[PDB]
Structure 1
Amino acid sequence: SLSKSPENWMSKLDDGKHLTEINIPGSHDSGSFTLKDPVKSVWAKTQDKDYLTQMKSGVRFFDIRGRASADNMISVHHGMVYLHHELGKFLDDAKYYLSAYPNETIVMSMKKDYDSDSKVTKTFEEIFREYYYNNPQYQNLFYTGSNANPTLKETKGKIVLFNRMGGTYIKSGYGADTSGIQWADNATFETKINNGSLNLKVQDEYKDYYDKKVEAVKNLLAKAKTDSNKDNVYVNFLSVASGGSAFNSTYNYASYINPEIAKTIKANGKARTGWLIVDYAGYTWPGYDDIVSEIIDSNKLEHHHH
Structure 2
Amino acid sequence: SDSLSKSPENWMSKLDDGKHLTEINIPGSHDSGSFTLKDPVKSVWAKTQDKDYLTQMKSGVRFFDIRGRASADNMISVHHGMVYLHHELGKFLDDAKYYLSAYPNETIVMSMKKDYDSDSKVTKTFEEIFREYYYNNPQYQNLFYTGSNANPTLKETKGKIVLFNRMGGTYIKSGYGADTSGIQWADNATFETKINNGSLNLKVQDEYKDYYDKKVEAVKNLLAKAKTDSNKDNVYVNFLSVASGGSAFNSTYNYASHINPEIAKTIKANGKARTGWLIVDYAGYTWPGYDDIVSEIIDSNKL
Q: TM-score range by the shorter chain?
A: over 0.9
| Gap change, CA 1:32 and 1:219, over 3 Å in 2 | same
* Kept after mapping to 2: 8 A contact 1:75/1:82: yes
Distance (whole Å) between structure 1 residues aligned to residue 29 and residue 150 of structure 2: 23
1:219 paired residue number:
221
| Gap change, CA 1:144 and 1:269, over 3 Å in 2 | same
Distance (whole Å) between structure 1 residues aligned to residue 247 and residue 254 of structure 2: 14
| Gap change, CA 1:245 and 1:211, over 3 Å in 2 | closer
Distance (whole Å) between structure 2 residues aligned to residue 233 and residue 244 of structure 1: 25
* Kept after mapping to 1: 8 A contact 2:263/2:293: yes
Instruction: Tell me the CA shift for residue 108 of structure 1.
Output: 0.1
Distance (whole Å) between structure 2 residues aligned to residue 113 and residue 208 of structure 1: 20
Range moving further from structure 2, 30-39 or 246-255: 246-255
- Mark the runs of 5 or more structure 2 residues left unpaired by the alignment: none
Q: Cα deviations across residues 41-62 of structure 1 (Å, max 9, x unaligned)?
A: 1111000000000000000000
Instruction: Tell me the CA shift for residue 246 of structure 1.
Output: 6.3
Instruction: Tell me the CA shift for residue 245 of structure 1.
Output: 8.0
Distance (whole Å) between structure 1 residues aligned to residue 295 and residue 103 of structure 2: 18
Q: TM-score, normalised by structure 1?
A: 0.97
Q: Cα deviations across residues 22-78 of structure 1 (Å, max 9, x unaligned)?
A: 000000000000001111111110000000000000000000000000100000000
1:304 paired residue number:
none
SS of equivalent to 1:85 = strand
* Kept after mapping to 2: 8 A contact 1:271/1:299: yes
Q: Cα deviations across residues 85-134 of structure 1 (Å, max 9, x unaligned)?
A: 00000000000000011100000000000000122111000000000000
Instruction: Tell me the CA shift for residue 247 of structure 1.
Output: 5.7
Distance (whole Å) between structure 2 residues aligned to residue 255 and residue 245 of structure 1: 14
| Gap change, CA 1:222 and 1:245, over 3 Å in 2 | closer
Distance (whole Å) between structure 2 residues aligned to residue 93 and residue 138 of structure 1: 12
Instruction: Tell me the CA shift for residue 244 of structure 1.
Output: 11
* Kept after mapping to 1: 8 A contact 2:211/2:247: no
Q: TM-score, normalised by structure 2?
A: 0.98
SS of equivalent to 2:244 = coil
Q: Cα deviations across residues 231-250 of structure 1 (Å, max 9, x unaligned)?
A: 00000000001269866211
Q: Cα deviations across residues 272-306 of structure 1 (Å, max 9, x unaligned)?
A: 000000000000000000000000000000xxxxx
Distance (whole Å) between structure 2 residues aligned to residue 204 and residue 242 of structure 1: 14
* Kept after mapping to 2: 8 A contact 1:43/1:244: no
SS of equivalent to 1:243 = helix
Distance (whole Å) between structure 2 residues aligned to residue 253 and residue 197 of structure 1: 36
2:5 paired residue number:
3
| Gap change, CA 1:246 and 1:262, over 3 Å in 2 | closer
Distance (whole Å) between structure 2 residues aligned to residue 248 and residue 240 of structure 1: 12
* Kept after mapping to 1: 8 A contact 2:104/2:158: yes
2:186 paired residue number:
184
Distance (whole Å) between structure 1 residues aligned to residue 246 and residue 299 of structure 2: 36
- Mark the runs of 5 or more structure 1 residues left unpaired by the alignment: 302-306
| Gap change, CA 1:158 and 1:57, over 3 Å in 2 | same
Distance (whole Å) between structure 1 residues aligned to residue 236 and residue 19 of structure 2: 15
* Kept after mapping to 1: 8 A contact 2:81/2:116: yes
1:63 paired residue number:
65
| Gap change, CA 1:174 and 1:245, over 3 Å in 2 | closer
SS of equivalent to 1:242 = helix
* Kept after mapping to 1: 8 A contact 2:171/2:178: yes
Number of equivalent positions: 301
* Kept after mapping to 1: 8 A contact 2:210/2:246: no
SS of equivalent to 1:65 = strand
Identity %: 100
Q: Cα deviations across residues 124-170 of structure 1 (Å, max 9, x unaligned)?
A: 00000000000000000000000000000000000000000000000
Distance (whole Å) between structure 2 residues aligned to residue 173 and residue 57 of structure 1: 24
1:86 paired residue number:
88
Distance (whole Å) between structure 1 residues aligned to residue 112 and residue 65 of structure 2: 7
* Kept after mapping to 2: 8 A contact 1:42/1:242: no
* Kept after mapping to 2: 8 A contact 1:73/1:86: yes
* Kept after mapping to 1: 8 A contact 2:249/2:255: no
Once superposed, what is the RMSD of the aligned Cα atoms?
1.1
| Gap change, CA 1:246 and 1:269, over 3 Å in 2 | closer
Distance (whole Å) between structure 2 residues aligned to residue 26 and residue 243 of structure 1: 19
SS of equivalent to 1:140 = coil
